[PDB]
Amino acid sequence: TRSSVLADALNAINNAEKTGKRQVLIRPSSKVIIKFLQVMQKHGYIGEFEYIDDHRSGKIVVQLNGRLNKCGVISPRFNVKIGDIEKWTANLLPARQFGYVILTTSAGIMDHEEARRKHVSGKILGFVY
Template sequence: MVRTSVLSDAMNSINNADRMGKRQVLIRPASKVTVEFLNIMQKNGYIGDLNKCGVISPRYNIKISEVEKWVTKLLPARQFGHIVLTTSAGVMDHNTARRKHVSGKILGFFY
């Protein structure tokens, strides 16, 4: 079986383990993007207290002006959750991208 997206497989295994009540998940293989995504989740405190995480495929280009539209589409509330973007300044959440005034491709979300 061919893996189409390592990041998508990782997020699905995290969601499945969370539903089953497991506390640990082994993710293999792991790409640099997957590690950065998980680092952002950890910095925001969502590793132990996660409701849902997902990947957006294909990775759409979004402008700074379109970030709010994606936030209302993907997240359950304005101040709840994060959208992860890959930009020229690195992988970051939508709040950091807005502060740094950069845009890029959307990777996924978590809340």
């Protein structure tokens, strides 16, 4: 059955970017997905997007500009400590210059550089570049 939802969401986003499209329809939605896409939208790998209610669990329509190369999830959400970030940014990013491994800390979900600046850690969801 359908076990992860952020994984399916980034699957659909990445497939539509590979085909070169402009929008996606994600079903269902989650709070985690919304926060993740806000992290994307802050650096601007996507444009604006939109929630849709159907009283069950929402759908999302995303406008995607051209800027996403690849996004993905790390499906067992590993526990990470502070120096451990320097492992994963050595694994997943394409350079030291850009790319965002994103974490789920107790102070919210955000990219790794903010968790360097806020000096927190937590678990890991995925990577965007």
